[PDB]
Amino acid sequence: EYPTSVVLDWIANYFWPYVRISSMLMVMTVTGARFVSPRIRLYLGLAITFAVMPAIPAVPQDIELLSFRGFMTIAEQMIIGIAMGMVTQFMIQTFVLLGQILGMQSSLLLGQLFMFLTTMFFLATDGHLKMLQLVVFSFKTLPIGSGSLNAVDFREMAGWLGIMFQTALSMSLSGIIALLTINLSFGVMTRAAPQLNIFSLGFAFALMVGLLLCWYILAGLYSHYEMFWTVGEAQICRLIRL
């Protein structure tokens, strides 16, 4: 044999799967966090790619490492990885949306409270393991050589903003109605004497009830997360055509 074929193939058979894996990690909720150093994340991507190597099919040998076609392959591996990563960011920020709408309606940082708890939901439900299982499955059903995200995948991923508001409103509709009715009830009941008004007195009353309602929101938030994850996971499988 000529040693060029052996060495080049392994680099092509390792880095190209790694790029998709690494690109998903940098956009992922947990592995792409600001707390972890890039070096720890880099080693994690290297270790995952090495371990899941047997399940990854051999890349086509037609495309050369030093060629413009190989350059396009690197870019389209990232696009697949970022697609999975953005879905995870969409879910967590939707809960951040849920936290801030309650806080805004509470006459008021509350997004961080929901963001941290939703991160715990992601870790406790083994969401990170499922994403890693999804990306290795992507290697099977969406081969590296022939295959990339089409225009329909971009439009479906661009339509997730409506998914955010609809899901965030659905979670908070019961609480937001409660916030409005008590504030309207407080307004009408104290409207008899225009001397009292509310102003800052209304600020104190609104925030106490808003915090209390957030206590109710956290009581039944887990069920909403489970339904939300199913919607997000289905979108991810649609991207990888599984």
């Binding site: 499922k130 299982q133 499955f137 069920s223 489970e226 339904m227 199913t230 499988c237 599984l242």
Partner: protein
Amino acid sequence: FGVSQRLEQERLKLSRERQLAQAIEEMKQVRKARVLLALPKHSVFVRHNQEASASVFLTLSTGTNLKQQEVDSIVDMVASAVPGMKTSRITVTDQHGRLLSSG
């Protein structure tokens, strides 16, 4: 309102049983039908699915008996009624309790 996903699914499947039970009422031989379904989820993340199953309890007429034809016809009809759950995974039982199909 207030029904969450899983519950909704039951409210589907159970109802199907009723109408499938309904489909067995019009048969001359069967007086009453009750279908029991076992439908797991696809669950791509688990490599071992326990697979669907069915078990049907029938109160027949005062008499009458079926050798092999009627039980086979009914098991095929039920199997083709529910997605997946191939025909070999249905257990059929009667009032007298003679085994009619494995699963």
